[PDB]
Write a protein that binds this DNA or RNA. Structure first.
Ligand SMILES: *[C@@H]1O[C@H](CO)[C@@H](O[C@@H]2O[C@H](CO)[C@@H](O)[C@H](O)[C@H]2NC(C)=O)[C@H](O)[C@H]1NC(C)=O
Ligand SMILES: *[C@@H]1O[C@H](CO)[C@@H](O[C@@H]2O[C@H](CO)[C@@H](O)[C@H](O)[C@H]2NC(C)=O)[C@H](O)[C@H]1NC(C)=O
Ligand SMILES: Nc1nc(=O)c2ncn([C@@H]3O[C@H](CO)[C@H]4OP(=O)(O)O[C@H]43)c2[nH]1
Ligand SMILES: Nc1nc(=O)c2ncn([C@@H]3O[C@H](CO)[C@H]4OP(=O)(O)O[C@H]43)c2[nH]1
Ligand SMILES: *[C@@H]1O[C@H](CO)[C@@H](O)[C@H](O)[C@H]1NC(C)=O
Ligand SMILES: *[C@@H]1O[C@H](CO)[C@@H](O)[C@H](O)[C@H]1NC(C)=O
Ligand SMILES: *[C@@H]1O[C@H](CO)[C@@H](O)[C@H](O)[C@H]1NC(C)=O
Ligand SMILES: *[C@@H]1O[C@H](CO)[C@@H](O)[C@H](O)[C@H]1NC(C)=O
Ligand SMILES: *[C@@H]1O[C@H](CO)[C@@H](O)[C@H](O)[C@H]1NC(C)=O
Ligand SMILES: *[C@@H]1O[C@H](CO)[C@@H](O)[C@H](O)[C@H]1NC(C)=O
Ligand SMILES: *[C@@H]1O[C@H](CO)[C@@H](O)[C@H](O)[C@H]1NC(C)=O
Ligand SMILES: *[C@@H]1O[C@H](CO)[C@@H](O)[C@H](O)[C@H]1NC(C)=O
Ligand SMILES: *[C@@H]1O[C@H](CO)[C@@H](O)[C@H](O)[C@H]1NC(C)=O
Ligand SMILES: *[C@@H]1O[C@H](CO)[C@@H](O)[C@H](O)[C@H]1NC(C)=O
Ligand SMILES: *[C@@H]1O[C@H](CO)[C@@H](O)[C@H](O)[C@H]1NC(C)=O
Ligand SMILES: *[C@@H]1O[C@H](CO)[C@@H](O)[C@H](O)[C@H]1NC(C)=O
Ligand SMILES: *[C@@H]1O[C@H](CO)[C@@H](O)[C@H](O)[C@H]1NC(C)=O
Lengths: 776, 774
RNA sequence: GUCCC
RNA sequence: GUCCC
């Protein structure tokens, strides 16, 4: 098809509408800028490479560039690879950028630069120098940036990238940048708010610094500011997972009552880890529009019970008072001030880490009349006692989150309140809530449940009981009131499936997760009824992964409704022991089942009967990670609606003589990570239904035309070949040609479609291989 | 050293004292008997190979053979590999064995044989034909076995190896085998006890068959029999994990009351899975010496509460009544008959699977006066309630086993009572600390001191696999003043308090592995410094705890010798830039063994080694995805003897190992990405004794890297599964490997050339390189 | 590759 | 390969 092979080791995309030519060279182990980058190129990314220098030749031809992303070509020693340390900082020669008349955005983060690069064109709206070694800002070095709007200078002096001094900012350094909207000086060892900043600021990031005091006029002129983050100045250091130095005498960040008076526009204020003991209402006298307030990781436990400042926050959407507990105090209860009632607009309230023994209904009354409240997060509070029925007054809420507590009778990262910098950029780039009302009781100490535990909660759509201690012979009496429940996450418990009536009271249940309930499945002689499915009339999806199931009293699972079954990490090798026919029809009576996952079941072979016993509408089958050493391909004939076969991470050595003759229906075939050395002569002949084919990470040496007829290849959405053992002799002439000239999408042509030999061409990409010597 | 390279792909061992020459060819992907087997060869093993035939040429020279082990060269379809199925049964030509005048033992199990091989010498004392296809025994075929003593015929007709008919045994087939001691007809589809058997039998195995009835005189003459197993004839099939066909009418195996009268010598009687409802005392009227009785997997729940037969068993060492519960009955308590008191000799009692709600002290009184009782096993009973204090009356017992129950306020295989055949042949723990109370796999959520009142004598407590979610503060085990071993694994330790466990003042070993729960949620306080309070602790296991944070910065002990810290997140604690935890193990002054494998340590920040306590001998950094390693830093570890760096991504070795560590004896670098050795790698590294470089990508090895004055001290040197290039540059290496004394495993199997083309796939032991010397 | 798996 | 890990 193609007349001129694409040899450039970068992805190239046309966005014809927005007039853009996008060249992505992210992570291509480059040591030079590749030649032949299109002249029409507008967005060029060279992130994560080892190009040691930039020069006028770097971009000479590329006069249409609006964005260069040149991050992490020399990342500071402690942030970067220890196996591929950068030897010497990126060198930028003069005039490298002054040519680029249309350049709007320049990223040079993570290059060990000592100074703000000079000679930048006046077109530049965005400059980014995170994780460099620039810790002294001077007015003179900034004059070139007159039209700059966004400026990132953070992560240039902190514990992962130390500069061993205080950050220096000359007086009025930023004042003449009259268009500057966004200024980020986070994670920098700054000692004072730099002044005077231009009144044109919308966003100021000053977090994770050594600022002890805000002067009353530090933000005098900033009438346009929308976001201010002063977090992690005088930090709360208890249980900090980074080196943390508090302000002396447990001082807080000192903020004058009138510091915020100019900030009429402020929408987000962030005062996380500022060791605050008081929130003066006077702060918010002229901020009527504040929406998001973060007061997590302070010492505001007392204040939570007073909190006059809330009376001045009627438009607040989001409030975070997480982790304000006094060290070595375990409060009997939660004292929320009446003031919380004045938060007419509040959608999201979070108070993790108040740390209290017992939660009672009336303690939450300050919230009864917040009409817009969607999320209430009382996680990580070590609550021992809580009558769940209290939440009957909270039908309107989308999520009630009591995760990580000690109870017995819109998602946040695993590390969140204790990350150093949760917004920090990586070198790459730049859940049942949807079912309805969700009660998250995950990670508590619930050993035993009964119906009255759930009295008055019939409105729930999702209950999360993951990671409790539930060890009970559920018999269908325990969840009686949960008439609306669509989703139950019962993972990481100790289900005892003695009774086939387990869960049958949850009459509207669409999804059940009983994964990682392996305990009782590990002791011989225990009765388990896997036939419990029959009683669940609307169940769509069952997850029973990592249950180590090696026995069952019942011989068949039954459902008229079940569409998907995850059965990963069990012992079907033991149930289907060769010679024992009793369980070969375990899934057969799941008549509507379309998706089945029996990966990680130690199936080194499949006894005959397995495929005949599969239910008739099976579409999507995974046998991945089974250590399969053999596979009778013909047996795929029984699976008449099979569309996806995942056989990844096994030990298969062969493909079928003709895939067409094994399955007419099969569209996606995944054989990545096997031991295939060669393909059958007529492998894909007449396999007209085939659309996707992964042969990556095998040991294939040759591919001949017969195996891969073009009337199949040209239907394929994707064909993966990378990481094989290709031999680039004159016998590979067809394959090499076809790869060079095909339209078919083949990932990693630049990176890992490589010759292993013969010696001469070893390690050389096949896309670049010249084989003319074979045609004399 | 060696003048004639060993080219035979079999291990060869001299036992000079017993006059034996042992050749082991087990599992060497052979398709022929190798030539050059020594003539003096006495024991020859060819197990697990693909040799398709035996012939007079097979052993022609080997006239001094006493044992041929030729198992599993053609295993039946369903027992064998499905990826390397055997195409056609083993063919044994006539005269193959008649040469072998001294042959005592012959194993031909697992070869798909259709008939008992003929032509066997009269010297033969043991013949073994398990897992063949021989399901009709004829007197005529056995005449050749006149001097036979041990004869295995089992596993020739059962569900893994079906023959599709009943087993046939001609009348008196075994009678004229006048020396036969041991006969095994297990797992065979036998319908009746074959008669008449020779009176010379000591052991008869008839289990897992289709025997419905014992005739009163089936065992008439067997006055010498010691072991009888009739198990799995009319099996109890509830929750059986194999195809199980009960006798119709829920009938038991029918045993007439006088069936055993001749068996004065019987020591072991095994009646497991015989669907027995009664044990008539009359059975044991003439057996006073019975020692071991298995009555597991019957329906003897009622009988347990009567059990007059025990009055006739004063010499019984071992009794098993496990799994006798009536289906869908959950008894309130255990009714043991008074009769149990008469078992003066009983060392071991097992009653799993009685299935009852509550155990009370007095229910065990029938046992109070059994002086010799060592083991009491009440596992898998779904016991809801048990006052542990009752065991105060049982100080004398070595093990009290309450494992797999439902309690809250030798070792047996994982599958045991429900295996088909627990004795079946393959083709190839805190008990020792003293009194042990095994409470593993219960539902204990909360513990307090009174739970252990009166149990001060305990040496081992196993709480593994409970629900313990408690901020242990050192008050909970107060009474356990003697406890040497605590297994607290698979719980949910909340290490808030650094006084946890401190009351266990005699504790030598603590396992708190797989207590990861509270370690997975940010902002929770954990005191890893709890070790300080544990004055005699030798060994601490805290594996698979996913530990990524700690309030305290150092662990302290004067006593601790071994710390297992596998499966945690030291990569997070030691984040580059954060110096605070680099001395976590430094103050464990007597620590000799440390395991920090599986901690995702892709690199070691500088200071890790300086922070290691001074007497560290044995260090594992396996399975960390290490891509780089500053070998010089090994200088800090002055008493280092073992470094395990297996399963990582290392690409190089140090320029001189001698200049990194003088002390290092064992260096394990298996499963890395090493492509070459440094020029003078091992020069002067005289202390080195073990070196694993297996599963790397090494191409060449030169004499400079591997000087002979080091190599020849090595106990073991592993090289297998590398990328060796067998050009004329490899002349030295190839020569040295061929001629060295040094032990190198897998020379026959996986020390292979990958090239050049010509020599590809060829073993280096067999490589001829004369073309290099013209 | 006789039991485990 | 800046937050993670
Ligand atoms: C942040 O700046 C402080 C001081 O402003 C730096 O600390 C000084 O650094 C040197 C080397 O550690 C010491 O000898 C001085 O004693 C320090 N002075 C003070 C007052 O602490 C600190 O290193 C900087 N932090 C980072 C991570 O670069
Ligand atoms: C044990 O022997 C029985 C006969 O007692 C075998 O069962 C016969 O085999 C075929 C095929 O299964 C049936 O059509 C016959 O009717 C069976 N006969 C009877 C009397 O049932 C059985 O297959 C043998 N067992 C094994 C494991 O090989
Ligand atoms: N799984 C299970 N959990 C229990 O808590 C229980 N109590 C009695 N039983 C009985 O134990 C036998 C083996 O588990 C089961 O068979 P059953 O007699 O129907 O009744 C069962 C229990 N089984
Ligand atoms: N680990 C833990 N388990 C608890 O049960 C508990 N109750 C209160 N707390 C307090 O929560 C804080 C963070 O875990 C701990 O710090 P503390 O204030 O010393 O007291 C602790 C508990 N901590
Ligand atoms: C291309 O660059 C412009 C300006 O830097 C930017 O707004 C646009 O999103 C970029 N797109 C891509 C895909 O790089
Ligand atoms: C709650 O806290 C406030 C402010 O600290 C305190 O004054 C008040 O007495 C407390 N009220 C209750 C109900 O505990
Ligand atoms: C929980 O509170 C409800 C009121 O919603 C009440 O009916 C129920 O009895 C309470 N349960 C307990 C143990 O207090
Ligand atoms: C339940 O909570 C657990 C642990 O907090 C989390 O992994 C899981 O995603 C939650 N389940 C659902 C369905 O959202
Ligand atoms: C379940 O247990 C309840 C009470 O806990 C008992 O009353 C009943 O037998 C069981 N119900 C069903 C539907 O099996
Ligand atoms: C499940 O199987 C058992 C037999 O093992 C049967 O008694 C029970 O009622 C079955 N349950 C259903 C829902 O079919
Ligand atoms: C098939 O199922 C897997 C999970 O088992 C899923 O990730 C994949 O997207 C599915 N594909 C199709 C085409 O149904
Ligand atoms: C496979 O191929 C043969 C010959 O073309 C044909 O007879 C047979 O029906 C085919 N089976 C399928 C399922 O295509
Ligand atoms: C060698 O064969 C004899 C006879 O079968 C036996 O007693 C001895 O234990 C065997 N030794 C080995 C090492 O096979
Ligand atoms: C357990 O038994 C002991 C005596 O062995 C008694 O002192 C204690 O009170 C008992 N505990 C209970 C709850 O019965
Ligand atoms: C404790 O019991 C567990 C769980 O059954 C068992 O695996 C372990 O070996 C026992 N502990 C010790 C130290 O013997
Ligand atoms: C531990 O807690 C118990 C109560 O459960 C308390 O009585 C005891 O004094 C505490 N011990 C220590 C060492 O703090
Ligand atoms: C452990 O360290 C903590 C402070 O981090 C301290 O409270 C406690 O005294 C220490 N405990 C021991 C036993 O050293």
């Amino acid at each position: 098809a193609r007349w001129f092979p694409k040899t450039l080791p970068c992805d190239v995309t046309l966005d014809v509408s927005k007039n853009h030519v996008i060249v992505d060279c992210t992570d291509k182990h480059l040591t030079e800028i590749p030649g032949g980058i299109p002249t029409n190129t507008t967005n060029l990314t060279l992130t994560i490479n080892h190009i040691p220098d930039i020069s006028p030749a770097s971009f000479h031809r590329l006069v249409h560039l609006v964005e260069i992303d040149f991050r992490c070509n020399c990342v500071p020693i402690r942030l970067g690879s220890k196996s591929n340390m950068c030897p010497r900082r990126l060198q930028i020669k003069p005039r490298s950028f002054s040519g680029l008349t249309y350049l709007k955005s320049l990223y040079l983060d993570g290059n060990q630069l000592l100074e703000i690069p000079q000679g930048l064109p006046p077109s530049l709206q965005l400059l980014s120098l995170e994780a460099n070694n620039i810790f002294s800002i001077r007015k003179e070095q900034l004059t070139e940036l007159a039209n700059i709007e966004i400026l990132y200078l953070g992560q240039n002096c902190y514990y992962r990238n130390p500069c061993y001094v205080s950050y220096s900012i000359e007086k009025d350094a930023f004042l003449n940048l009259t268009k500057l909207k966004v200024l980020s000086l986070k994670d920098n060892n700054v000692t004072t708010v730099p002044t005077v900043l231009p009144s044109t600021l919308t966003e100021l990031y000053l977090y994770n610094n050594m600022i002890a005091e805000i002067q009353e006029d530090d933000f005098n002129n900033l009438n346009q500011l929308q976001i201010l983050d002063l977090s992690g100045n005088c930090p709360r250091c208890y249980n900090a997972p980074f080196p943390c130095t508090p302000c002396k005498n447990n001082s807080p960040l000192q903020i004058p009552v009138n510091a915020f008076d100019a900030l009429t526009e402020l929408k987000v204020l962030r005062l996380h880890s500022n060791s605050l003991q008081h929130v003066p209402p006077r702060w918010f006298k002229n901020i009527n529009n504040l929406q998001e307030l973060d007061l997590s990781q302070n010492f505001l436990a007392k204040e939570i019970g007073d909190a006059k400042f809330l009376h001045f926050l009627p438009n607040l959407i989001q409030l975070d008072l997480s982790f304000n507990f006094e060290l070595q105090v375990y409060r009997a209860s939660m004292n929320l001030s009446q003031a919380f009632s004045s938060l007419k607009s509040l959608k999201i309230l979070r108070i993790r880490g108040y740390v209290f023994k017992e939660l009672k209904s009336f303690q939450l009354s300050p919230l009864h009349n917040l009409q817009n409240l969607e999320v209430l997060d009382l996680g990580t509070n070590f609550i021992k006692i809580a009558n769940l029925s209290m939440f009957k007054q909270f039908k309107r809420l989308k999520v009630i989150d009591l995760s990580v507590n000690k109870i017995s009778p819109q998602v946040l990262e695993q590390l969140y309140y204790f990350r150093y910098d949760k917004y920090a950029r990586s070198c790459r780039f730049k859940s049942c809530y949807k079912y309805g009302q969700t009660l998250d009781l995950s990670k508590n100490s619930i050993f035993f449940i009964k119906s009255s535990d759930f009295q008055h909660l019939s409105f729930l759509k999702c209950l999360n009981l993951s990671g409790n201690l539930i060890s009970q012979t559920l018999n269908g009496s325990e969840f009686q009131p949960l008439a609306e429940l669509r989703y139950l996450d019962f993972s990481n418990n100790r289900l005892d499936l003695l009774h086939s009536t387990a869960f049958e009271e949850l009459r509207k249940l669409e999804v059940l997760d009983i994964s990682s309930n392996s305990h009782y499945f590990q002791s011989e002689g225990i009765t388990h009824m896997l036939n419990f499915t029959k009683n669940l009339k609307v169940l769509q999806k069952l997850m029973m992964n990592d249950n180590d199931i090696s026995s069952s009293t019942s011989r068949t699972m039954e459902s008229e409704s079940l569409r998907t079954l995850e059965f990963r990490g069990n012992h079907l090798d033991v149930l289907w022991r060769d010679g024992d026919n009793r369980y070969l029809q375990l899934f057969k009576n799941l008549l509507k089942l379309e998706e089945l996952d029996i990966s990680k079941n130690s199936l080194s072979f499949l006894p005959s009967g397995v495929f005949d016993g599969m239910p008739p509408n099976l579409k999507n089958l995974s046998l991945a990670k089974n250590g399969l050493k053999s596979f009778i391909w013909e047996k795929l004939r029984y699976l008449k609606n099979l569309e996806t076969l995942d056989l990844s991470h096994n030990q298969l050595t062969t493909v079928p003589e003709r895939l067409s003759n094994c399955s007419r229906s099969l569209k996606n075939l995944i054989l990545k990570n096997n031991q295939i050395r060669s393909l059958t002569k007529y492998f894909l002949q007449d396999a007209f239904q085939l659309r996707y084919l992964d042969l990556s990470s095998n040991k294939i040496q040759m591919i001949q035309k017969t195996s891969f007829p073009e009337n199949v290849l040209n239907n394929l959405k994707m064909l993966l070949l990378h990481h094989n053992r290709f031999l680039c002799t004159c016998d590979a002439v067809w394959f090499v040609w076809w790869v060079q000239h095909t339209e078919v999408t083949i990932p990693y042509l630049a990176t890992d479609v490589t010759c292993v030999g013969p010696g001469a061409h070893k390690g050389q990409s096949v896309i670049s291989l010249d084989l003319y010597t074979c045609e004399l």
